[PDB]
User: Which sequence fits this backbone?
């Protein structure tokens, strides 16, 4: 039972930096490739980022390309998403998923290719 | 294929003989022309005391009944000199505990082809093979296989193309000599083989022979003990009417232990080894 | 070369004699690599074109060893919908070797392929197949509705849904025991809280993408302390001769000129060294012949010139080289009307001490002026 817990979200001032931490408890965390997605009201669900077991190669979507960083820690069984130069348009619920490594670009938009689904955390920007 | 204890075994003190200059093999796969080279490796010492095992069963008055399938520790390396006439010696088995707990290796000629397996076998106390001389067919056929009972949890497997040979027992002196060197170095099982036509019964002739590397087994398992699978002809069908019995044709072999030593090998213009001198001899 | 002699001697005035200035060498053109012919392909074709397929509860396991894993033959087809891999990326799995390969094959529903993801816990991901905590392979899957679907349907495929506890990794439990619960244990029957673990698949053309049958093959590479046996294919380029190059023969790296020889190597011998413990001959891994390695040509550069007061005409001497490699061994790239004229021409003479350029060979004999070697002397006077 790989339980997923999300933390680090909340309301932050504009122009700052944020760190969202997703911790997975289980004996097969290393076998999982960590995917991060976002969901906002009035907007369709879009893929955000994906990182492999080792973390050397990661894939990010074009709208979020070159704006956020993803990192992993197998010893702590945790994954971190760093948001830099935050914007009010990024106020949304972020979800972390673990399980399976994918190489097809068009297959990153489906949430059915992951083992466990979490709850996510809300990120809000105050102007 | 069942495991049955072998009775009517006659105890006889172990015999040892001189290996002379035998046991020299190619240290590697390099080529030298009329070159002397000093190699430090696992080599059989010259004029070493090699254990002699007999395989014969007289019937007049001695009642020898010699059939040896011992449990010789493998140590660093093994040298085996097998003298025979009609392929009496059939194969070898190697392993640490020789059961299903540890990993075991087997090489044997099945009277049709040579087979090499690395399986978690169930070898009995005295595994062996038998050949039956049916009178109706007037030929020798192999219909006896009781080496093991199971081969579960197996990794390696190799079967060669079918061969052909005559199993009829020859009468006279030995006419075939096979020299083998087995090493278990760096997780690699290396086998060196050499063949020689001979005519004698004991006291191996003076001479020099180089064992060419026949096959290499990429098995990283640990080997500490080994047994010899020997063939024999049942003596209860044709040469007997009282009860069950078995006899072994005239055969014998020699087992020697390799030692870490420096040997001086001479290569002629053809690249083969002509003579070898061990520094630690004298 | 008078300028080089002046630079080496640190004097604008050069006395009559011979002086060594620099050295020349021959570099490999690009590279040469060779390897034995690939004739030990793993039996992946039988799995690819299997006539009969095994059910999930009887998922088939195949041992792969002592063979070369050439995955390009199936990669170029690109006929597999799911081509996910873990541990090593698919495009870079060639440059590493493993000692064994496990190939587990089965046929499941179209939407259940994600259930074969590593580390997943679920009805199908725990009760039908289990995996360890480490993976170094692929979970490939593809559609199989073309062959596995027929008129009338099939009922020979069963899946497990009910069981007491999670399956042990790398175990195929083929059992028909009825699941029992502590609240109401049937203890011999199939009453309340007791149902058959296995249910039959439904094969029909009307099934959707999720319900369409899919063939799933998961391959797991593994390496231990034992020597590796399943290595990736290694490409071997064409073999060149009579040309200096850096060669890689069966992992042996050398630099030199490979020339045809007449040595009769032993069948088990791969290469052959000399007394000085240096590589001398190599057997071509693909086709059987022996090639000797000449360690290039190289040598010293000596300038033959009289005194600068007498004249400025100079001659060039190369040590231990034939009069054919001079324009290639770091030449024809300097200033043209000075150095390129002293590398070729009609003044090229071959001597036992090497190649001499800039002097004319005469059958007459005179007193020695500038010695060269092996009874050769150069004189400025006609």
Assistant:
């Amino acid at each position: 039972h790989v339980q997923l817990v999300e933390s680090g979200g909340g309301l932050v001032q504009a122009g700052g930096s944020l760190r969202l931490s997703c911790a997975a408890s289980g004996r097969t965390f290393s076998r999982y490739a960590a995917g991060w997605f976002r969901q906002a009201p009035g907007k369709e669900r879009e893929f955000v980022a994906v990182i492999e077991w080792d973390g050397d190669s990661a894939y990010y979507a074009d709208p979020v390309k070159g704006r956020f960083t993803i990192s992993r820690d197998n010893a702590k069984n945790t994954v971190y998403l760093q948001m830099n130069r935050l914007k009010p348009e990024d106020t949304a619920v972020y979800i972390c998923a673990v399980g399976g490594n994918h190489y097809s670009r068009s297959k990153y938009y489906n949430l059915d290719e992951y083992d466990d689904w979490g709850q996510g955390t809300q990120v809000t920007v105050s102007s | 294929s069942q495991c049955v204890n072998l009775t009517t075994r006659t105890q006889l003190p172990p015999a040892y003989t001189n290996s002379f200059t035998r046991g020299v093999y190619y240290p590697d796969k390099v080529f030298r022309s009329s070159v002397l080279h000093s190699t430090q490796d696992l080599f059989l010492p010259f004029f070493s005391n090699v254990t002699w095992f007999h395989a014969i069963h007289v019937s007049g008055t001695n009642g020898t009944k010699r059939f040896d399938n011992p449990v010789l520790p493998f140590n660093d390396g093994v040298y085996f000199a097998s003298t025979e006439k009609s392929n009496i010696i059939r194969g070898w088995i190697f392993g640490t505990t020789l059961d299903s707990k540890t990993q075991s290796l087997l090489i044997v000629n099945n009277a049709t082809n040579v087979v090499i397996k690395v399986c978690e076998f169930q070898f009995c106390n005295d595994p062996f093979l038998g050949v039956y001389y049916h009178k109706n067919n007037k030929s020798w056929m192999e219909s006896e296989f009781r080496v093991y009972s199971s081969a579960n949890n197996c990794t390696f497997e190799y079967v060669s193309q079918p061969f052909l040979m005559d199993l009829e027992g020859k009468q006279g002196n030995f006419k075939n000599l096979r020299e083998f060197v087995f090493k278990n170095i760096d997780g690699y099982f290396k086998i060196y083989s050499k063949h020689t036509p001979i005519n004698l019964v004991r006291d191996l002739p003076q001479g020099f022979s180089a064992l060419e590397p026949l096959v290499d087994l990429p098995i990283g398992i640990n080997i500490t003990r080994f047994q010899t699978l020997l063939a024999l002809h049942r003596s209860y069908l044709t040469p007997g009417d009282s009860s069950s019995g078995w006899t072994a044709g005239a055969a014998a072999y020699y087992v020697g232990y390799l030692q870490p030593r420096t040997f001086l090998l001479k290569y002629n213009e053809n690249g083969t080894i002509t003579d070898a001198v061990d520094c630690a001899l004298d | 070369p008078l300028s080089e002699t002046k630079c080496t001697l640190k004097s604008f005035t050069v006395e009559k004699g011979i002086y060594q200035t620099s050295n020349f060498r021959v570099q490999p053109t690009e590279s040469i690599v060779r390897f034995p012919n690939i004739t030990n392909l793993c039996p992946f074709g039988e799995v690819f074109n299997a006539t009969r397929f095994a059910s999930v509860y009887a998922w088939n396991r195949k041992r792969i060893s002592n063979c070369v894993a050439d995955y390009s033959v199936l990669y170029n087809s690109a006929s597999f919908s799911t081509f996910k891999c873990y541990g090593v990326s698919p495009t870079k799995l060639n440059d590493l070797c493993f000692t064994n390969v496990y190939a587990d094959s089965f046929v499941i529903r179209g939407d259940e392929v994600r259930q074969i993801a590593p580390g997943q816990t679920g009805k199908i991901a725990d009760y039908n197949y289990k995996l360890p905590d480490d993976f170094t392979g692929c979970v490939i899957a593809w559609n199989s509705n073309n062959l596995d679907s027929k008129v009338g349907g099939n009922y020979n495929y069963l899946y497990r849904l009910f069981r007491k506890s999670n399956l042990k990794p790398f175990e195929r439990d083929i059992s028909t025991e009825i699941y029992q619960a502590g609240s109401t244990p049937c203890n011999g029957v199939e009453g309340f809280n007791c149902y058959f673990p296995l249910q039959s698949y439904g094969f029909q053309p009307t099934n959707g993408v999720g319900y369409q049958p899919y063939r799933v093959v998961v391959l797991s590479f593994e390496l231990l302390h034992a020597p590796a046996t399943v290595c990736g294919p290694k490409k071997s380029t064409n073999l060149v001769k009579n040309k200096c190059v850096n060669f890689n023969f069966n992992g042996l790296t050398g630099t030199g000129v490979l020339t045809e020889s007449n040595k009769k190597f032993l069948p088990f011998q791969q290469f052959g060294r000399d007394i000085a413990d240096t590589t001398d001959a190599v057997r071509d891994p693909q086709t059987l012949e022996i090639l000797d390695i000449t360690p290039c040509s190289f040598g010293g550069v000596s300038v033959i010139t009289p005194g600068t007061n007498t004249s400025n005409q100079v001659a060039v001497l190369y040590q231990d080289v034939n009069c054919t490699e001079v324009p290639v061994a770091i030449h024809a790239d300097q200033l043209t009307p000075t150095w390129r004229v002293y590398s070729t021409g009609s003044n090229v003479f071959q001597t036992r001490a090497g190649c001499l350029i800039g002097a004319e060979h005469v059958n007459n004999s005179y007193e020695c002026d500038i010695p060269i070697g092996a009874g050769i002397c150069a004189s400025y006077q006609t």
The radius of gyration of chain A is 14 Å. Chain A touches chain C through 23 residues (CB under 8 Å). Chain A is about 0% helix and 45% strand.
